[PDB]
Ligand binder design. Structure first.
Ligand SMILES: Nc1nc2c(ncn2[C@@H]2O[C@H](COP(=O)(O)OP(=O)(O)NP(=O)(O)O)[C@@H](O)[C@H]2O)c(=O)[nH]1
Ligand SMILES: [Mg+2]
Length: 357
């Protein structure tokens, strides 16, 4: 696997992006009404357009109804509400996020989501060209007075990126080398950011799993990267959120309909190349956010630096093996507990105990 095109951090954000009045803030408000209170993040300053929501996980809940810890800690997704494009402070708001929830209109009050996919598409490609051109101009000036091998390599990349963007293609869909990605991460280009398509439609359409605009959207996406498309009804989700659990479950069974907000949160979290491992014990069961392609020692460090500095090994059992057999004791008895070294890339769902010092 090649290195991942993304910002070097685990404090990642996802931004709600789309044309005016497509249901962005309604979606955000449904998110907020289901968000973790701001005071739970004392190290942070959470703006009114920001929200942090828990990531649901069926493995995590199984690890609770088998351990009953003192504290249960889920992972979270940070979502940022950006206003609609009317043309920016819009482009500087996208610069602050790492992935995109691309919200599309597919409901009747010209309704053309494919056009909107091109409209946002162009606006993002063009803004990237402005960034890349400004770099080429800056690199060329420096090369007149310097002979650093890096200045040529960066210029060479920029020019390849410039031609890629001008051909209508997005940065994240180019075939880049390792050293190419490392420099691209230094730019954090707009069309490098992964997207999830959230197609907003009427409750009726969403319920009967049929929409007139979807086959076209689907055909376009397949021709432009093949990223995930989630159909959803903003109105319906709004209506369900304002209900108490009692009525909400009754409304769902009676209308044969179900919320997709969980899947949205789960897909957003995965989209921005975040995964988590578990530490399961009788005192704590916690999902530990890490970036995909993190090695075992670095994963140890996020819990406590001693774990990384003194790293001996990571004792990892797979969830399925714990599920099939009895418990931790039963798993060790069968000898499933793999002892993985410094070179081991942590896989999502790994239940880990670290050995150090
Ligand atoms: N029929 C219908 N109307 C919607 C839907 N979502 C949004 N709207 C309309 O759009 C208006 C604004 O709602 P909002 O969720 O803020 O949309 P927005 O995309 O955040 N607008 P902005 O681009 O200014 O941030 C609402 O008053 C409503 O009339 C929808 O799913 N169905
Ligand atoms: Mg809004």
């Amino acid at each position: 696997e090649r290195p991942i095109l993304g910002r070097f951090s685990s404090h990642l954000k996802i931004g709600i992006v789309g044309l005016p009045n497509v249901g962005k803030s309604t979606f955000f408000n449904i998110v907020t009404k289901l968000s973790i209170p701001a005071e739970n993040f004392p190290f942070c300053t959470i703006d009114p357009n920001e929200a942090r929501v828990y990531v649901p996980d069926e493995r995590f809940d199984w690890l609770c109804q088998l351990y009953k810890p003192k504290s249960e800690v889920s992972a979270y997704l940070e979502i940022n509400d950006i206003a609609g494009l009317v043309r920016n402070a819009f482009l500087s708001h996208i610069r602050a996020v790492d992935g995109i929830f691309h919200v599309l209109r597919a409901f009747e009050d010209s309704v053309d989501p494919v056009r909107d996919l091109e409209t946002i598409g162009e606006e993002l490609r063009l803004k990237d060209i402005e960034f890349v051109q400004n770099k080429i101009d800056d690199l060329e000036k420096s090369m007149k007075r310097s002979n650093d091998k890096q200045l040529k390599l960066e210029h060479e990349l920029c020019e390849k990126v410039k031609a890629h963007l001008e051909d209508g293609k997005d940065v994240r869909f180019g075939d880049w080398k390792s050293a190419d990605i490392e420099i691209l991460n230094t730019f954090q280009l707009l069309t490098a950011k992964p997207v999830v398509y959230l197609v907003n439609m009427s409750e009726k359409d969403y319920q009967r799993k049929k929409n007139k605009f979807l086959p076209k959207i689907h055909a376009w996406v397949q021709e432009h990267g093949g990223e995930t498309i989630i159909p959803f009804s903003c109105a319906f989700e709004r209506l369900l959120a304002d209900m108490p659990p009692d009525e909400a479950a009754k409304y769902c069974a009676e209308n044969q309909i179900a919320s997709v907000i969980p899947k949205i949160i789960k897909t957003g979290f995965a989209a921005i190349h975040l995964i988590y491992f578990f530490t399961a014990g009788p005192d704590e069961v916690k999902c530990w956010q890490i970036r995909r392609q993190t090695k075992a020692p670095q994963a140890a460090g996020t819990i406590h630096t001693d774990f990384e500095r003194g790293f001996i090994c990571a004792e990892v059992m797979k969830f399925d093996d714990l599920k099939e057999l009895g418990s931790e004791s039963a798993v060790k008895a069968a000898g499933k507990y793999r002892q993985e070294g410094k070179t081991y890339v942590v896989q999502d769902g790994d239940i880990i105990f670290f050995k150090f010092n």
